[PDB]
Ligand binder design. Sequence first.
Ligand code: A1H1Y
Length: 138
Amino acid sequence: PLIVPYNLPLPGGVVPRMLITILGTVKPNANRIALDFQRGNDVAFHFNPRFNENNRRVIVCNTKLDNNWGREERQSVFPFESGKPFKIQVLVEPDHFKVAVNDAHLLQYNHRVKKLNEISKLGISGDIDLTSASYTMI
Ligand SMILES: CO[C@@H]1[C@@H](n2cc(-c3cc(F)c(F)c(F)c3)nn2)[C@@H](O)[C@@H](CO)O[C@H]1C(=O)N(c1cc(Cl)cc(Cl)c1)[C@H]1CCC[C@@H]1O
């Protein structure tokens, strides 16, 4: 059990076959969660569950370059529940991030930021109790 916000170092950035696992529990009155894979100030991959955007639940993904958000990729399939334990797994592949939640595939996000070996931090924020954040190579 760790304090949020939390920054997990990714030394030398990410590489294909790297599997990042975030474990925690969604808070009971959760509104938002974010994962931010950063290259300096740039956000290579922002993964953002929203629990109440116009009274519905949505996953928003985007990239931030030079402090500007790009074109959003949205998904209505929403595997999180307020109050429940979750596992987010981000698998780095050569051309995309692949996300699975609770062992079920959720989405893919094509690499907009190309310098994977400079994506050297993961920020974790929002309405969760964070249990652990770690990575391994599959
Ligand atoms: C509130 O800003 C959103 C961004 N964001 C979220 C968080 C955040 C999340 C957490 F879970 C958390 F815990 C935390 F601490 C911080 N920090 N930054 C990002 O989530 C960003 C992703 O595109 O969206 C921003 C956004 O809400 N919009 C937005 C989209 C674009 Cl492209 C351009 C601008 Cl100027 C705005 C709206 C406008 C209308 C529809 C669109 O979705």
